[PDB]
Every structure is written in C-alpha cells, then in structure tokens.
Amino acid sequence: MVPISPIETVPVKLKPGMDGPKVKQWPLTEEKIKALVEICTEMEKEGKISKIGPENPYNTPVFAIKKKDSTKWRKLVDFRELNKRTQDFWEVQLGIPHPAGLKKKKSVTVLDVGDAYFSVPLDEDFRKYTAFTIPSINNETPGIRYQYNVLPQGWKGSPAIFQSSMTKILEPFAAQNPDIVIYQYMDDLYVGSDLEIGQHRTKIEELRQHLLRWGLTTPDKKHQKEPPFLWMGYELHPDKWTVQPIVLPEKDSWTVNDIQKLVGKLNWASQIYPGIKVRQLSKLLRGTKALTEVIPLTEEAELELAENREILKEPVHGVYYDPSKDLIAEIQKQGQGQWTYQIYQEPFKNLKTGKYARMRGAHTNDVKQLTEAVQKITTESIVIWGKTPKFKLPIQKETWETWWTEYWQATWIPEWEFVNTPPLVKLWYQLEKEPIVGAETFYVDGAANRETKLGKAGYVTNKGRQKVVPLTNTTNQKTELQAIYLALQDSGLEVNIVTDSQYALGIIQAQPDKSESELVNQIIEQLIKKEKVYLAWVPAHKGIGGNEQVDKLVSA
C-alpha cells in the first residue's frame, strides 16, 4: 500500500432552524428495484454509499431512469428537498473567463479527473441528511436504507465543494510551475503551455504524479478531446477563438419566441462580429410577451436583419491577449441610440467586439451616450484584462472640452484620441452664459385648466411683439414648453428668453439633443438654428415685469 493524503472534508450545515428532508419514496416497478439494488450494491462496494440503521429519520426519493435505447438503468436520487434546506455556499463557477482575455498557447492537454469527481468525501455529520430508501419487492420487507459518503450528484454543495477541493490539490502544482496554466471544468482538467512539446508532456506526467498523492488516477489511455474545444458557447483554438456557429433562420412569419431567440443569437454574435444591431428587432418585443404571438416585422426590422445577415456571412475570429501590448478600444455611433466597439492590440486583429444601447429615458444626447459606452467598455476591460484600454473616439478634443467644462455634472473619460470616422459626436447647441446685447427679449408663459385640458401659451417682448395661442389637450408643464417653442419660432438668430418654468429649465439644462417628447424635439430643432440663445429663469408671481403681463394673458 502506498499511503495517500486524505482529502479534507468541508463542514456543512443545514440552514438555521431547518431540519433535514423527510420525503416519501415513490413506489417502483419490481424491474426498477432490482436494477437499483444492483447499482447500489456496486456503489457500496466502492465506498460511495453505506447501509444505515432504522434510526435515521431522514429520506430523499430515489428513481430509476432508462437510458434511451438501453437495457441498462441509471440511478437518480432527487435532492430537491435537501437542497432547499442546505446552506448557501461560495460559488466560484460564476465569472466564466472570456476567451478574449486568454493567452495564446502552443499546447493544451486534457486529463480525465472523473475518478476524483465522484470520490470527494462528504462531511461526516452531514451524511445522515442524504439518506435514501430502495423500496422492497412486494413491500414485504423493510426497504434498503443507504446514505452517501461522498458528494452526491445533484446535491447543492457538490459543485462548489468539488471545485474547492480540486483547487486546493492543484495549488502547489500551479505555484511551482508558473510556465503552465491549469483550468478545471466538470470532470476534466485542461493544461496549457508554451513549452517545447517534450517538456509539456513531462509537465503532464508530473501533474499525474502529483495527483497520485491523493490517490486520484488519470486514465493511461489519454483524452479524445483536442483543440478546437467547444466550450461555453465558444470555439477555442490554440491561437484564436470564436463563437460557435451563428445561423439566422429564414421565416415568412416571426413570433415573440422566435424574435427572442434571434436577438439572443445576435447578442451572442456581437462579441466577435463587428457592427451587429439589435434595436429594431428588440422593439418588436415591447410590451406584449404572449410567447406564440406572431409579430409583423417593420421595414426597419427587415433592414436590420438583412444588415446582420451580411455581417454573419462568413466566420470571424478573435485573437488572444498579449500582455506586453497596449489595448485599444474604438467606438462608432450607429444611430438610434446604438453604439458599437472593437478592442484590439495589432491593427485589424480584434480580441473582441461589442455593442452598447442607449438607456431608456425622456431625454438624452450623443455625448452622454458615448460617455456611458466608454464606462461600460472600461469596466468590461478591467474584468477581462485588468486594465483600461486607450480609446479612439469619434468626438473632437475641443468638443469634449467644451462639454465637460460647462456640464452641470462631474464627468470624465480616460485617456483617448479623436478618430475621424463619421458620424462624429458634436454639440448641437450651447446656451449663452450672459444676456445678449441687442437681441430681442421674449417673456414667455403658459397655463392650462387642469380639468378641461384647455390652455394658452405665449410671449411678450421689449419690442412690443406679442403672441398668445389657444390650446387643447394640454397641461401646465406642456404649455410652458409650448411658450418657449413660440419664442424660438418667432425670434431672430439671437434671442433672450425669460421663463418662470423650473420644469423647462430642468430639461434644457440637461442639454438633450433628442427626446421622446415631440415638443422637446422641435424645441431642440429650433435651438440648432439659432446663433445665440440666452435662457433666464425668474420666480413666478413675484411682480416681475413682462412675466406678470404674459402670465395674465395665458391664464384666460
């Protein structure tokens, strides 16, 4: 006997106040019972389960599932109830590596750890909660009672405990062999390196020797698995990666469910294929959510789909990360609140691509969206590469400078350079800091009846220009904007506007270039045509000249 190191058990508890499962065993056909008896007899010989006395109060139901085509049964213990009562664990399998952050490897070998997969010991005090019963034939004897000595498949704690146990075993090997990488997925270990293939093979044997210390055997006959690997929806190759094949179906009719799966495919593709756009296709899913409902595609959605098909015409691959080189991120504006980006090190070789969509809100502008896109790419890049890429942005340095210095919020974007690739992001209007000498002054106001929704909007000016428009289906807030629109419409290229509307000021001070409100949009269109606009606020009803006058006119 060669002494082996025991794998240390993880102490496990039920959630506070909760007891273990007690769940009736379903009746089973005599056929299924005999198969379970045989299966458990073998499992018991291997030390995986043990027969227990009558004193154990707990139970979890056991099933016999027939493999398709097979004459051979499989045992299924349904742990759903125990899992509800089991404590939460630290789950390390969240945070999957992104292929774009991986490093190129000369060789990647796969080892089968399945022997260990079913061999990790379960905490002795917790074992009783895993009790199950094979029903006796004819119900004429007590059922055969077992409990698990090892991590049960399907139990809540098995994946985390297996991963942590394997990690602890592998740790000294990884640490003392910096020239390889080791990754654990299910019952396989993947080992890559840049070593000469002989040396690489040596490291593999050494790893096999190291695992033997715990008595974990890796099969002599080695793995069928080779690069390329199909993993988590990707294809990993030694020098490149991509997403698994993306094929968009042909249809004369589309439903909620199909458009959902279409967008999901497009979203997945967008991390490699540049320029993917989901806006119009996503819009078809607005509200609704009756899954089998057939939605007519808009012309816009058809156009977007056709554009995506062309992008997806032939395979595209990303390269891996070279830590000795800068990361560059480039962004383009696609329209309709859509942004797209590429991250690369060498020109014309992308590590990855991606997209960003405008957040839903009443009002927005291109500069804010660009800023948001930058912060998203930054965060993603910290996750994947641990550093911020240098940005190439379709906005001039002078434009950015004017924006951030005058914007009411603190705002920042990290090191970046202008790339001239239309459409460029620009400031469509900027309001004056001081009243304009020689420009006509418009005092505006509006008011609406809360019940009838009847209202008025208008202005009076220092030149005696005046207007009041009667309105229907309007609100006080809307009339305040309506009045500002009239002042813009009727004035020359330079204008001073005085309003009492905090609402209107709040919107305009937010500097939107686009809005869900048609009124705000037409106001923006007017602002764009002016040379100079000064907007002044005064409090309402204070006796302020020209504000008093127009307030009276519009109050009916």
Ligand X SMILES: Cc1c(CO)cnn1-c1ccc(F)cc1
Binding mask 519-548 for another protein (x = CB under 8 A): ---------------x-xxxx--xxxxxx-
295 binds, among another protein, Mg ion, ligand X, none (CB under 5 to 8 A by kind): none
Give the shortest CB-501-to-another protein separation in angstroms: 11
Q: Pick the stretch among 30-38, 340-348, 406-414, 533-541 that binds Mg ion (CB under 5 A).
A: 533-541
Half-sphere exposure of 300 (CA within 13 A, CB side): 10
Q: And the tokens for 453?
A: 């929704």
Cβ closest to ligand T27, residue 142 vs residue 323: 323
Q: Is 187 annotated as a binding residue?
A: yes
Total residues interacting with another protein, rule: CB under 8 A: 76
Q: Is 252 annotated as a binding residue?
A: no
41 binds another protein, rule: CB under 8 A: no
- Binding test (CB under 6 A) with ligand T27, winner from 47, 97, 361, 506: 97
Instruction: Return residues touching ligand X (CB under 6 A).
Output: 378-379, 382, 457, 469, 482, 485-486, 518-519, 522
Q: Could you tell me if 354 and 270 are in contact, meaning their C-beta atoms sit under 8 angstroms apart?
A: yes
H/E stretch holding 296: none
Sequence-ordered list of residues with C-beta below 8 angstroms from that of 139, at least 6 positions apart, any chain? none
C-beta atoms surrounding 306 within 10 Å: 9
491 binds another protein, rule: CB under 8 A: no
Q: Residue 287 to residues 281, 296, 474: CA-CA distances in angstroms?
A: 13, 15, 26
Give the shortest CB-143-to-ligand X separation in angstroms: 53
Binding mask 433-472 for Mg ion (x = CB under 5 A): ------------x---------------------------
Give the shortest CB-497-to-Mg ion separation in angstroms: 14
User: Which residues in 207-246 contact ligand T27 (CB under 6 A)?
Assistant: 227, 229, 231, 236-238
Q: Could you tell me if 443 and 460 are in contact, meaning their C-beta atoms sit under 8 angstroms apart?
A: yes
Residue 76: which of 22, 147, 152, 128 has the closest Cα? 152
Cβ closest to ligand X, residue 346 vs residue 516: 516
Q: Could you tell me if 425 and 370 are in contact, meaning their C-beta atoms sit under 8 angstroms apart?
A: yes
Give the shortest CB-348-to-another protein separation in angstroms: 23
160 binds another protein, rule: CB under 8 A: yes
Strand-pairing partners, residue 330, are 342, 392
Q: Kindly report whether the peptide bond that precedes residue 228 is cis, defined as omega within 30 degrees of 0.
A: yes
Q: What span, in angstroms and rounded, lies between the C-alpha atoms of 211 and 190?
A: 14
Preceding-residue numbers of gaps in the chain (C–N over 2.5 Å): none
212 binds, among another protein, Mg ion, ligand X, none (CB under 5 to 8 A by kind): none
The SS3 of residue 553 is helix
161 binds, among ligand X, ligand T27, Mg ion, none (CB under 5 to 8 A by kind): none
Q: Is 112 annotated as a binding residue?
A: yes
Residue 51: which of 124, 135, 123, 131 has the closest Cα? 131
Cβ closest to ligand T27, residue 266 vs residue 384: 384
Q: Residue 309 to residues 122, 262, 281: CA-CA distances in angstroms?
A: 51, 11, 13
Give the shortest CB-477-to-Mg ion separation in angstroms: 12
Binding mask 174-213 for ligand T27 (x = CB under 6 A): -------x-x-x----x-x---------------------
Residue 220: which of 228, 229, 212 has the closest Cα? 212
- Binding test (CB under 8 A) with another protein, winner from 506, 528, 531, 556: 506
Give the shortest CB-224-to-ligand T27 separation in angstroms: 12
Look at strands 144-148 and 132-134 and give their pairing: antiparallel
Binding mask 451-490 for ligand T27 (x = CB under 6 A): ----------------------------------------
Chain-centre distance of CA 127, in angstroms? 38
22 binds another protein, rule: CB under 8 A: no
Binding mask 451-480 for another protein (x = CB under 8 A): ---------xxx-x----------------
Give the shortest CB-325-to-ligand T27 separation in angstroms: 16
Sequence-ordered list of residues with C-beta below 8 angstroms from that of 392, at least 6 positions apart, any chain? 328, 329, 330, 331, 416, 417, 418, 419
Give the shortest CB-534-to-ligand T27 separation in angstroms: 59
For the chain, the helix, strand and coil percentages under 3-state DSSP, each to the nearest 5: 30, 25, 45
Q: Is 69 annotated as a binding residue?
A: no
Give the shortest CB-190-to-ligand T27 separation in angstroms: 4
H/E stretch holding 520: helix 518-529
Cβ closest to Mg ion, residue 366 vs residue 551: 551
* Binding site feature residues for Mg(2+): 112, 187-188, 445, 480, 500, 551
